[PDB]
Each structure stands twice: as C-alpha cells, then as structure tokens.
From Swiss-Prot, chains A, B, C:
Disruption phenotype: Abolishes recruitment of the mediator complex to the upstream activating sequence (UAS) of amino-acid starvation responsive genes. Decreases RNA level of genes involved in amino acid biosynthesis and cofactor biosynthesis during amino acid starvation or methyl methanesulfonate stress. Growth dependent on amino acid supplementation. Sensitive to amino acid starvation. Sensitive to purine starvation. Decreases cellular glycogen levels during glucose starvation. The chain holds residues 250 to 277 of 281 of the full protein. This is General control transcription factor GCN4. Phosphorylated by the cyclin-CDK PCL5-PHO85. It is found in: Nucleus. Induction: Translation is induced by amino acid or purine starvation, or during growth in low or poor carbon sources. Translational repression during nutrient-rich conditions is dependent on four uORFs (upstream open reading frames) present in the 5'-UTR of the mRNA; these promote ribosome dissociation. Translational induction occurs in conditions reducing translation machinery efficiency, leading to ribosomes scanning over the uORFs, and increased translation of the mRNA. The rapid translational induction is followed by transcriptional induction at later time-points, independently of the uORF sequences. Master transcriptional regulator that mediates the response to amino acid starvation. Binds variations of the DNA sequence 5'-ATGA[CG]TCAT-3' in canonical nucleosome-depleted 5'-positioned promoters, and also within coding sequences and 3' non-coding regions. During nutrient starvation (low or poor amino acid, carbon or purine sources), it activates genes required for amino acid biosynthesis and transport, autophagy, cofactor biosynthesis and transport, mitochondrial transport, and additional downstream transcription factors. Homodimer. Each subunit binds overlapping and non-identical half-sites that flank the central CG base-pair in the pseudo-palindromic motif 5'-ATGA[CG]TCAT-3'. Interacts with the mediator tail; the interaction with GAL11/MED15 is direct. Interacts with the SAGA histone acetyltransferase complex. Interacts with the SWI/SNF chromatin remodeling complex. Belongs to the bZIP family. GCN4 subfamily. Residues 2-81 form the bZIP domain.
C-alpha cells in the first residue's frame, strides 16, 4: 500500500521536474520574441512593394522632366545656330 | 488515511496532465511569435508617417520643377515666334 | 510513515501551485509578443538605410535638374537681352 503510493510519488516528482525544466526553457524562448509594442506591422509601415510603387511614380516624373529638358536644350541650340 | 492519500494523488495526476497540455499549447503558440532578431522596429525602419513626409517633400520639389519647365517652354515658344 | 507521505504530498501541491502561477505569467508574456503573421521583417519592408539610399538617388536627380534649369534660365535671359 505504502509501496504503491511511494512509486506514484516518484513518478509525480519526475513529471514535475520535467515541467520545471520545460518552463525554464520556455522563459528563455519568450525572451527571444519581439514585443507587440515594438514590432512594426502593416499599421505602422509600408511594405517593399508599396515603397517601390511610390518610388516608381517619382522616377517616371523625373525621367519625363529629363526628357523635357533635353528637348529644351536642343531648342536652344537651334535658336543660337 | 490511505484512501485520502490516494485521492490526493489522483488530483495531483489530473493537475499534472492538465498542466502538460497547457505547456504543449504554449510551445506551439510561442513558435507563432516573431523573433526579436527578425522583427523590424523603429530602430530599423521608417513609419508610414515618416515616409509620407519625405515623399511629400519630394513631390513639392517636383511640382516646383514642373512649373519652371512649363515657364521655360513658353519662353522658348515666344522667342521662336 | 503516513505522516511523511502526507508531507511529500504537501510539498508536491506547493510545487504545483507555484507552477500554475508561472504558467499564468507565461501566458500573459506570450500575449505581449508579436505574431509572425503580423511582424514586418526584411522579407516585407525596407530598412531606414535602404530607404535613405533610394531617397539619395532621387535627390541627386532633383539636384541635376535644378542645376540644368538654372543654367537654361541664364541662357534664355542672355538670348533675350
């Protein structure tokens, strides 16, 4: 009777020790994780694709401008010839 | 006396099983969390507000340029007439 | 004999109560962590440095353009004098 209880107690203590070691490992893993309060999401930041689209709009306007200037410089060269 | 100890042991074993199931769930949840080593924060990235401020300044410069170019093209047109 | 078993059961119940409190804490910590499904990383977003480089490239072009426009305006003022 006592022997059976003692055996169950030994198994219980082993399970508890194992749990305590799992919890220690979990605490270490948690500390490797980023906080919600810090990490940027779609609510805070643009994606690469979103930035690329905005930059592309600018770049087309730059190229159009350069093209207009090149034409202007040729016009001036014709006037002064 | 032995009956009461056995009952407590049953309760302990149930509690342990419950705890083990919670830990298993916890481990799976942790694995769905982003790592500090990967997640971008204010130290790594601009916000949408920061980007928007920079893009609006560029657009203002572009708007200034386009006014100057239109003016020039009209000046040239007058010289050639 | 039965007294000593009762004391080991008391120590086990104390350990379990402590563990339950650790688990409750762990769950609270996990809920403060950002999800992989939400957090932006290098796979979703540019860094400040990467944006700065792109913005510097645009700024150079704007500078080139402003210089060309200033030159052209001076050339036109001379032609019309």
């Amino acid at each position: 009777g006592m022997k059976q209880i003692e055996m169950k107690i030994e198994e219980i203590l082993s399970k508890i020790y194992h749990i305590e070691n799992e919890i220690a490992r979990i605490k270490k893993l948690i500390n490797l994780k980023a906080n919600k309060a810090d990490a940027y999401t779609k609510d805070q930041a643009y994606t690469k694709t979103e930035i690329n689209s905005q930059m592309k709009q600018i770049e087309w306007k730059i190229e159009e401008i350069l093209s207009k200037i090149y034409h202007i410089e040729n016009e001036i060269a014709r006037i002064k010839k």
